[PDB]
Design an enzyme around this catalytic site. Structure first.
Site, mmCIF file in Angstrom:
data_model
loop_
_atom_site.group_PDB
_atom_site.id
_atom_site.type_symbol
_atom_site.label_atom_id
_atom_site.label_comp_id
_atom_site.label_asym_id
_atom_site.label_seq_id
_atom_site.Cartn_x
_atom_site.Cartn_y
_atom_site.Cartn_z
ATOM 1 N N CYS A 1 -3.417 10.624 -0.390
ATOM 2 C CA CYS A 1 -2.367 9.630 -0.620
ATOM 3 C C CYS A 1 -1.595 9.202 0.638
ATOM 4 O O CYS A 1 -0.917 10.013 1.274
ATOM 5 C CB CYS A 1 -1.380 10.144 -1.668
ATOM 6 S SG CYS A 1 -0.060 8.998 -2.019
ATOM 7 N N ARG B 1 2.811 8.992 0.514
ATOM 8 C CA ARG B 1 3.638 10.189 0.373
ATOM 9 C C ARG B 1 5.045 10.221 0.953
ATOM 10 O O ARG B 1 5.774 11.178 0.708
ATOM 11 C CB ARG B 1 2.853 11.436 0.789
ATOM 12 C CG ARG B 1 1.827 11.837 -0.246
ATOM 13 C CD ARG B 1 1.049 13.035 0.184
ATOM 14 N NE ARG B 1 0.088 12.751 1.227
ATOM 15 C CZ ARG B 1 -0.424 13.636 2.073
ATOM 16 N NH1 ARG B 1 -0.086 14.914 2.051
ATOM 17 N NH2 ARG B 1 -1.360 13.221 2.915
ATOM 18 N N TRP C 1 2.895 2.022 -6.305
ATOM 19 C CA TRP C 1 2.706 0.573 -6.201
ATOM 20 C C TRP C 1 1.494 0.342 -5.315
ATOM 21 O O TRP C 1 1.063 1.239 -4.588
ATOM 22 C CB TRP C 1 3.949 -0.169 -5.672
ATOM 23 C CG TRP C 1 4.547 0.367 -4.406
ATOM 24 C CD1 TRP C 1 4.037 0.254 -3.142
ATOM 25 C CD2 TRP C 1 5.787 1.078 -4.276
ATOM 26 N NE1 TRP C 1 4.881 0.847 -2.241
ATOM 27 C CE2 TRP C 1 5.962 1.363 -2.905
ATOM 28 C CE3 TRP C 1 6.767 1.501 -5.186
ATOM 29 C CZ2 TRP C 1 7.080 2.059 -2.417
ATOM 30 C CZ3 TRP C 1 7.882 2.194 -4.701
ATOM 31 C CH2 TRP C 1 8.025 2.465 -3.325
ATOM 32 N N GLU D 1 -6.395 -2.431 -1.386
ATOM 33 C CA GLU D 1 -7.040 -1.902 -2.585
ATOM 34 C C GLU D 1 -7.619 -3.065 -3.401
ATOM 35 O O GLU D 1 -8.747 -3.000 -3.893
ATOM 36 C CB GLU D 1 -6.042 -1.127 -3.448
ATOM 37 C CG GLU D 1 -5.354 0.047 -2.759
ATOM 38 C CD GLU D 1 -4.652 0.938 -3.760
ATOM 39 O OE1 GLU D 1 -5.363 1.624 -4.526
ATOM 40 O OE2 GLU D 1 -3.404 0.930 -3.814
HETATM 41 C C1 HEM Z 1 4.893 4.934 -4.116
HETATM 42 C C2 HEM Z 1 3.750 4.266 -3.768
HETATM 43 C C3 HEM Z 1 2.485 4.823 -3.541
HETATM 44 C C4 HEM Z 1 1.554 4.243 -2.744
HETATM 45 C C5 HEM Z 1 1.736 2.934 -1.946
HETATM 46 C C6 HEM Z 1 0.359 5.050 -2.826
HETATM 47 C C7 HEM Z 1 -0.866 4.657 -2.343
HETATM 48 C C8 HEM Z 1 -2.091 5.291 -2.568
HETATM 49 C C9 HEM Z 1 -3.376 4.781 -2.181
HETATM 50 C C10 HEM Z 1 -3.666 3.523 -1.367
HETATM 51 C C11 HEM Z 1 -4.308 5.660 -2.635
HETATM 52 C C12 HEM Z 1 -5.818 5.499 -2.551
HETATM 53 C C13 HEM Z 1 -6.424 5.061 -3.882
HETATM 54 C C14 HEM Z 1 -7.941 5.034 -3.857
HETATM 55 O O1 HEM Z 1 -8.537 4.695 -2.804
HETATM 56 O O2 HEM Z 1 -8.550 5.358 -4.894
HETATM 57 C C15 HEM Z 1 -3.603 6.727 -3.271
HETATM 58 C C16 HEM Z 1 -4.191 7.887 -3.783
HETATM 59 C C17 HEM Z 1 -3.531 8.942 -4.411
HETATM 60 N N1 HEM Z 1 -2.177 8.956 -4.653
HETATM 61 FE FE1 HEM Z 1 -0.773 7.681 -3.914
HETATM 62 N N2 HEM Z 1 0.547 6.145 -3.641
HETATM 63 C C18 HEM Z 1 1.829 6.006 -4.121
HETATM 64 C C19 HEM Z 1 2.359 6.843 -5.092
HETATM 65 C C20 HEM Z 1 1.769 7.953 -5.666
HETATM 66 C C21 HEM Z 1 2.390 8.794 -6.658
HETATM 67 C C22 HEM Z 1 3.706 8.445 -7.379
HETATM 68 C C23 HEM Z 1 1.541 9.866 -6.852
HETATM 69 C C24 HEM Z 1 1.657 10.993 -7.694
HETATM 70 C C25 HEM Z 1 2.768 11.462 -8.385
HETATM 71 C C26 HEM Z 1 0.396 9.624 -6.001
HETATM 72 C C27 HEM Z 1 -0.752 10.399 -5.980
HETATM 73 C C28 HEM Z 1 -1.959 10.113 -5.343
HETATM 74 C C29 HEM Z 1 -3.184 10.873 -5.488
HETATM 75 C C30 HEM Z 1 -3.359 12.260 -6.064
HETATM 76 C C31 HEM Z 1 -4.154 10.135 -4.938
HETATM 77 C C32 HEM Z 1 -5.636 10.429 -4.951
HETATM 78 C C33 HEM Z 1 -6.349 9.715 -6.090
HETATM 79 C C34 HEM Z 1 -7.844 9.951 -6.079
HETATM 80 O O3 HEM Z 1 -8.286 10.917 -5.430
HETATM 81 O O4 HEM Z 1 -8.586 9.162 -6.700
HETATM 82 N N3 HEM Z 1 0.537 8.450 -5.287
HETATM 83 N N4 HEM Z 1 -2.237 6.491 -3.266
HETATM 84 C C1 LIG Z 2 -11.059 0.160 -9.093
HETATM 85 C C2 LIG Z 2 -9.778 0.164 -9.921
HETATM 86 O O1 LIG Z 2 -8.808 0.753 -9.096
HETATM 87 C C3 LIG Z 2 -7.597 0.904 -9.600
HETATM 88 O O2 LIG Z 2 -7.255 0.558 -10.766
HETATM 89 N N1 LIG Z 2 -6.710 1.479 -8.771
HETATM 90 C C4 LIG Z 2 -7.051 1.901 -7.413
HETATM 91 C C5 LIG Z 2 -6.830 3.386 -7.270
HETATM 92 C C6 LIG Z 2 -5.396 3.802 -7.567
HETATM 93 N N2 LIG Z 2 -4.501 3.187 -6.603
HETATM 94 C C7 LIG Z 2 -3.213 3.603 -6.398
HETATM 95 C C8 LIG Z 2 -2.680 4.683 -7.118
HETATM 96 C C9 LIG Z 2 -1.367 5.088 -6.900
HETATM 97 C C10 LIG Z 2 -0.792 6.255 -7.668
HETATM 98 C C11 LIG Z 2 -0.575 4.421 -5.971
HETATM 99 C C12 LIG Z 2 -1.108 3.334 -5.244
HETATM 100 N N3 LIG Z 2 -2.421 2.924 -5.453
HETATM 101 C C13 LIG Z 2 -5.050 3.269 -8.976
HETATM 102 C C14 LIG Z 2 -5.318 1.762 -9.111
#
Ligand code: HEM
Ligand SMILES: CCOC(=O)N1CCC(Nc2cc(C)ccn2)CC1
Ligand code: HEM
Ligand SMILES: CCOC(=O)N1CCC(Nc2cc(C)ccn2)CC1
Ligand SMILES: C[C@H](O)[C@H](O)[C@H]1CNc2nc(N)[nH]c(=O)c2N1N=O
Ligand SMILES: C[C@H](O)[C@H](O)[C@H]1CNc2nc(N)[nH]c(=O)c2N1N=O
Lengths: 412, 412
Positions: free
Chosen positions: A109, A112, A281, A286
């Protein structure tokens, strides 16, 4: 003692000690080390208690001014609860702390820096699929907040014996369907073909559109999954427009405003929560790069190239680089114009660097997966690219799970 | 049995068995596992012989139609040579085979489809620094080939006892100097400040220019390094021009046509060659993105942004993405116009995918470092990004070495 880490851009050095508290397949998407599978029996007490004690110590150890008496009392109370019930319930404060720490410990993420800003919905008393649906609708509404996106997580009942798991079969709360049309062409999101079919098999009505929001497939108390259509009024979408190319709107593209991960498992102090959807958000790339430009997705790259009058038949012309950038501009421009929260990849990348710096001072480390943290475009243009990182699994943690349809024992 | 590998774009699956023949710090630039340090004693015979036998078996095992008698004779001859001399000499054919295999085994190289096309210069009989210089000049001339770049490698004498090592102190054969000017500003390549100073300390005359080709710092037979200026007639350069922006030429930029790694060590059948400079041809992004856009290098990004009339004070505008692409276009355009071999990152990426596919069929694997193989821009736009990869060290192999100035015992 510590692992030395270097930033090859600024020359800055950092010492990682946090990896000691951890529990070459680097580019593997779903490795076993990041997956927490199913069970058919409760967690052995000899394993549970130690983990429970550790978490309680971590929780009370996070306070500025210690509260020794409460710490001892809680340690005692938890042990007794484990002995008398075979498990234990986290206090609301402990759960809140755990969800934020798990986010803080998510190596993949980039957002963070926002870890301390998280709304927690306690749905641990939930019992039916209908109730799950209501909690999810409440979450979507709160998080969307009319475009001013707010981070939130809904925690469903923890795993008991592994036979009564609460699970959301969807990968995300909001996602578009994919249809294998009669003429052989694919309509919508090619990546959701199989899941869309599953929904259809379960009674959902296919609308054969380009952007049909998929229904929630909810599993409660280990029972068979039930389908629930998401009320359209709760799904905010952004129509894609380009600030200069009037023809961009002619592509008829749009995307949902809410990015919500729905199928992960929250691990904390020996407990496992198979259902805990969360959201933050969007980061522009993405949508602009993965959703719109991946060949196995909407694949709009070539069409945008032609409309720009580019040499789409000559790779060396770098037409692809030019097209993807205009699409990214369209995404950011559209979200901004429609007052929907979004962050570009450059700003996000700098944001993460600041966070990483903060983490090394606060606790001597920051688990980070370079392969996921570096944006899908302009890699070395972002600072994260030049930063050496250590990838390790701490606790609490958000794990992947085996796809539910592969391990589910149907009742009918 | 094998490791399963998946391409998340095409869904294709591959089975890796080659990793068995191998000898989380994934984003580490110079890990110990990729470094082969110095020694003060010959390789222990108990270690040497087994490695020697293994390589000889690999060499003879590579023929279409086996030559059993020669195989046995060579195995016997090598053993005797090791017993009577404490080491052994590779036949020219064995050396040629080894250099190509080491290239083939380089996890960080995207140009490996060209692995069988390599000119080998045998300089194992070299003895003086002057002779090294002559061999290097010959290499540069051959490789440059008036713009039609040819891949080549010059093999100097193998390490004996570790006290008589042949070493090129330069990181690359051709590289520009960096100067700390009186007014505090940095002129030239900021990344070569320290090395430039070393050259100056050794007698080289600083020219205080933006693109001053550094001299060769050559160490022969373990003796102190001698400085040798590269004859300007041997250094081909490309002046940077943009196909549309006439003002691009006003930036006064240029770069050398020859990309040559000079400080690596070739390991083969128990032998180590501390000096074996090699070269291929450039991939556009190396110059357009790393050299020109890295902040710790020429850092021309902002200046190009302004000249394009971009909103350089608003990151979200994605001005950086727009600028870097025009610079990449300039680099490719300039090399092409001046008839100098170069390959864009999209074409290279597709080329590597084809190679990887070829390797899995030929020998069941292809060591690959995702972090280095994915270009510094347009990551997911390239196919390599969607390919899962396994990173492992085989033999023969090209290793890094400890910087010579850190372990060298000066004679004066
Ligand atoms: C506040 C704005 C946030 C932004 C801009 C952000 C952005 C991102 C992005 C760009 C990814 C990559 C998604 C992908 O490539 O599949 C990601 C992954 C992740 N985020 Fe964040 N995030 C945010 C909030 C959160 C929150 C609120 C949580 C958890 C309470 C979180 C947990 C994670 C986790 C665990 C992943 C890995 C998902 C996976 O492995 O498929 N994120 N986030
Ligand atoms: C291919 C479809 O992908 C999705 O729907 N998403 C892309 C993967 C995942 N992105 C996120 C998730 C979070 C929690 C914050 C910012 N970005 C959730 C949304
Ligand atoms: C024929 C054209 C070739 C192309 C287009 C090509 C391209 C590349 C590129 C882009 C890199 C990354 C450089 C960096 O980021 O520092 C690289 C690295 C590498 N290449 Fe190739 N290469 C070619 C030929 C060769 C040859 C002839 C050899 C060896 C005989 C070779 C050995 C390697 C090695 C070992 C590395 C890693 C260098 C390091 O770790 O710093 N390459 N190559
Ligand atoms: C920062 C200076 O970088 C360089 O001089 N180079 C960049 C790194 C390296 N590139 C290469 C090397 C080879 C062998 C083939 C293609 N590209 C050698 C040239
Ligand atoms: C094969 C490789 O692991 C996969 O393509 C990756 C690469 N990086 C990445 N980053 C983010 N943020 N999300 C991702 O899903 C991926 N992966 N790819 O899709
Ligand atoms: C910290 C990280 O390992 C480093 O920035 C890397 C990233 N990728 C990469 N690829 C190539 N081809 N060459 C490189 O030097 C690097 N590294 N960075 O400069």
């Amino acid at each position: 003692q510590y692992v030395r880490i270097k930033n090859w851009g600024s020359g800055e050095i950092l010492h990682d000690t946090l990896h000691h508290k951890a529990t070459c397949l680097g580019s593997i998407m779903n490795p076993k080390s990041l997956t927490r599978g199913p069970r058919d029996k409760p967690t052995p007490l000899e394993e549970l208690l130690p983990h429970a004690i550790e978490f309680i110590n971590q929780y009370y150890g996070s306070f500025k001014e210690a509260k020794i008496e409460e710490h001892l009392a809680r340690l005692e109370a938890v042990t007794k609860e484990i002995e008398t019930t075979g498990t234990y319930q986290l206090t609301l404060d402990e759960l809140i702390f755990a969800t934020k720490m798990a986010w803080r410990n998510a190596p993949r993420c980039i957002g963070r820096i926002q870890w301390s800003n998280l709304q927690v919905f306690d749905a641990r008393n939930c019992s039916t699929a209908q109730e799950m649906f209501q909690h999810i609708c409440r979450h979507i509404l709160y998080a969307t907040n009319n475009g001013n996106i707010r981070s939130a997580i809904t925690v469903f009942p923890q795993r008991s014996d592994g036979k009564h798991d609460f699970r959301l079969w969807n990968s995300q709360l909001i996602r578009y369907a994919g249809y294998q049309m009669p003429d052989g062409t694919i309509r919508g999101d090619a990546a959701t073909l199989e899941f869309t079919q599953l929904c259809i098999d379960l009674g959902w009505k296919p609308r054969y559109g380009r952007f049909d929001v998929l229904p929630l497939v909810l599993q409660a108390d280990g029972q068979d999954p039930e389908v629930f259509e998401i009320p359209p009024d709760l799904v905010l979408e952004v129509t894609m427009e380009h600030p200069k190319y009037e023809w961009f709107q002619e592509l008829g593209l749009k995307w949902y405003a809410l990015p919500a991960v729905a199928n992960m498992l929250l691990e904390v102090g020996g407990l496992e929560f198979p259902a805990c959807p969360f959201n933050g958000w969007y980061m522009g790339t993405e949508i602009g790069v993965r959703d719109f430009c991946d060949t196995q997705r909407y694949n709009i790259l070539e069409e945008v190239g032609r409309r720009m009058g580019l040499e789409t038949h000559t790779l060396a012309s770098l037409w692809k680089d030019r097209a993807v950038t205009e699409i990214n501009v369209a995404v950011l421009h559209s979200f901004q114009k429609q007052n929907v929260t979004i962050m570009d990849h450059h700003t996000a990348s700098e944001s993460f660097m600041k966070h990483m710096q903060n983490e090394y001072r606060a606790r001597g480390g920051c688990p980070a997966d370079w392969i996921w943290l570096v944006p899908p475009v302009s890699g070395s243009i972002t600072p994260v690219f030049h930063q050496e990182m250590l990838n390790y699994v701490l606790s609490p943690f958000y794990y992947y799970q085996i796809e539910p349809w592969k391990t589910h024992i149907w009742q009918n």
